[PDB]
Every structure is written in C-alpha cells, then in structure tokens.
C-alpha cells in the first residue's frame, strides 16, 4: 500500500496473508479475505504458480510474533474457469482456497461481509485498501498491515480515455488514482473494504495497477468486483 497508515490490529479481522514456501521459510506474496471458517477469497493470479501455499490469519506484523496468528495449509485451489493468465485485463481474477482446517474466530479473526449480487457503488464511495504490499513503487513490503483511504471511481469515468480506457471492464471496481495512494505489489488478492449502510463490506479483490508504477495520477488501482461473482462463489462453496 503506497501512502497508507498503519492499521489498528483489530480493525480488519478478515484480512489474511497468503504465503508460499521459499527454501526453509515462508514469504508473503498476496492478501486474501476469510469468507468462511475454511475458505479464503483471493486473486487467481496469486495462485498461478506451482508453489506450496499457506494462509495466516490474525496477522499484524509479518516479522514478529503478535500472539494472535493461526497458520493453516491450503487443501484445494479453485480458480475462476474463465481466468486466463496471459490476459489479466480480461477480468475473472478471483480464486477460492479451501483451507486444511477451519480457523477459530475471535477479535482478530472474523469473516468478511460480501455485498449482495450486482451491487454497484456510487462514484466516490468511501473505501479502504489494506495489505502488506510495497510501500513505494519498486520499494519493499511493509512489516505491519497498512491501510489507505481510496474512494471509488465509477465505471464511466474509469473507462474514459484519460483513465484506464478499454482496459477496465464492468466486472471491475476502480478506486484511488490521486497519485499518492494506491495498492502495490504484495497487496493483490486482498480486500477493498467499502462502507455501505453503516457496515464495511468487501467489494473488491485487488488485481492490478499501471505499468508506469503503483501510485499514478488517473490510474486508479483496479479490483475484481466481488458482487459480479456471488453466484459463482456460493456455487463453489456449496459443492466443495
């Protein structure tokens, strides 16, 4: 997260760290949202590699014992059937991970609330991005969870030529684009939490940024729109 502030440790309890085994240690690679006690929602591009993944819930500082973490293996990865690794701009950047054990819920570990199917937010809706991603373009990962305020940019504006043009589709949400705040590498897969009717719901799964850099004026961070996939997500969980 570029331009973020450190999040309080109990503010976004659905946030997960998705990590892969690297030699004798584990490295953070993407974020995710806990949506059932044994299911996590993340981006399909985060699980493309043939790597061993684990999920960390209740995490705050990646490099220190917080005393609240739970570590769980991934048993099954279900990527959207239309996802195509060579065309991220085509959309469908979403995946569901079935965990090996159910986690225990508490103040630091809660389920993320999903919007109703088809819901679109009005332009400039108040949302926050969270993650341990790079804090500057070509910089380093954050040790502690960061958050940044990133108001939505509706489809009509976001798909205009000075923004993202035809690269953005109606199955995506744009947020930010002020040149100061944005998601960056390592935030992918994580949530975009938006306030609707007094409750924070997860409307986006972080997907991509510009080739010019993370925080670029008029190139808002682009997320998969969760509300476009509610039928698919429910269909997966019900049969697995």
């Amino acid at each position: 997260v570029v331009g973020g502030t450190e999040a309080q440790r109990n503010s976004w309890p659905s946030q997960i760290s998705l990590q892969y085994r690297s030699g004798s240690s584990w490295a953070h690679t993407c974020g995710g949202t806990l949506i059932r006690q044994n299911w996590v929602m993340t981006a399909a591009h985060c699980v493309d590699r043939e790597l061993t993944f684990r999920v960390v819930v209740g995490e705050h500082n990646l490099n220190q014992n917080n005393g609240t973490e739970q570590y769980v293996g991934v048993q099954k990865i279900v990527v959207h059937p239309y996802w195509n690794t060579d065309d991220v701009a085509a959309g469908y950047d979403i995946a569901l991970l079935r965990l090996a054990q159910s986690v225990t819920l508490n103040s630091y570990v809660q389920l993320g609330v999903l919007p109703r199917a088809g819901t679109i937010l009005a332009n400039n809706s108040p949302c926050y991005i969270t993650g341990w991603g790079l804090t500057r373009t070509n910089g380093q990962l954050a040790q502690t969870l960061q958050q940044a305020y990133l108001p939505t940019v509706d489809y009509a504006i976001c798909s205009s030529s000075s923004y993202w043009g035809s690269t953005v589709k109606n199955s995506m949400v744009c947020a930010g684009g002020d040149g100061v705040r944005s998601g960056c590498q390592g935030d992918s897969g994580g949530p975009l939490h938006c306030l609707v009717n007094g409750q924070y719901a997860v409307h986006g799964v972080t997907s991509f940024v510009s080739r010019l850099g993370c925080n670029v004026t008029r190139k808002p961070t682009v997320f998969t729109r969760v509300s476009a996939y509610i039928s698919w997500i429910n269909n997966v969980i019900a049969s697995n």
């Binding site: 991220v88 701009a89 998601g183 390592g186 935030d187 992918s188 991509f208 940024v209 510009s210 080739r211």
Partner: peptide, 4 residues
C-alpha cells in the same frame, strides 16, 4: 497492466 501490472498484476500486484
């Protein structure tokens, strides 16, 4: 585009 850059996946992040």
């Amino acid at each position: 585009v850059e996946p992040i």
